[PDB]
Design a protein around this ligand. Sequence first.
Ligand SMILES: C[C@](O)(CS(=O)(=O)c1ccc(F)cc1)C(=O)Nc1ccc(C#N)c(C(F)(F)F)c1
Length: 238
Amino acid sequence: IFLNVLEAIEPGVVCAGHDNNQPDSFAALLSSLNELGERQLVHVVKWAKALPGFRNLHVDDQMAVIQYSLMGLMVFAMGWRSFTNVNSRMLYFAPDLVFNEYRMHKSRMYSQCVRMRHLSQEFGWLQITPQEFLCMKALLLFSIIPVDGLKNQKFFDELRMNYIKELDRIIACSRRFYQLTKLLDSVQPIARELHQFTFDLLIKSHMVSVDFPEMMAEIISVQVPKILSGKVKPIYFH
Ligand SMILES: C[C@](O)(CS(=O)(=O)c1ccc(F)cc1)C(=O)Nc1ccc(C#N)c(C(F)(F)F)c1
């Protein structure tokens, strides 16, 4: 049942709407990445609310959790797409927004892209199955919270424990659990760098001609600073 549900609600392909015949400039690439974030968020919200037990969370906690984990969720899914499509050769953000070495450099996110390709490669090196991927991604949604707790922290804690149990069931083993939890932890440092980069970019967006959609601009200025200031922190296993 659990896996049936995860497979049924998994989001489909999402395009960035990037004009590929235009020069690879910083402004053009990040305006497209920003738009893609706006588009993937829409799918992530519907995905999360359809997750087993998610609705048990307080309404305000639901939105908060989705916004705090959006970056990591997108990174993880992206690494899996790149692995399954181009075999981690390039970064497959969207069918119409694939990053090669030139784009990695022009986006001024080269170092982060390298780490993301490393993650993508892990899917191959660890021979991660579609089921493991699905369970792990669901767990990622429940991996970052306010140090002072959510409105209803007990429900969240209960749910997170349940999802950890499901990952354990899919594996069933100790070596595998060690490897998968290590992989999940590796997403956070990456998300953090993207969060920092995104924040700085928003602040100076008017000077570098980069456009940010409404919802992304709100999340970057309201939720992301909470993470960068230490009020909201990821839940590491190790
Ligand atoms: C630079 C940026 O455009 C910032 S953003 O999308 O507006 C954003 C704003 C706030 C967040 F919490 C998360 C993401 C970005 O990280 N976009 C983005 C778009 C698509 C994908 C994918 N797939 C990813 C990444 F997760 F893979 F890095 C990142």
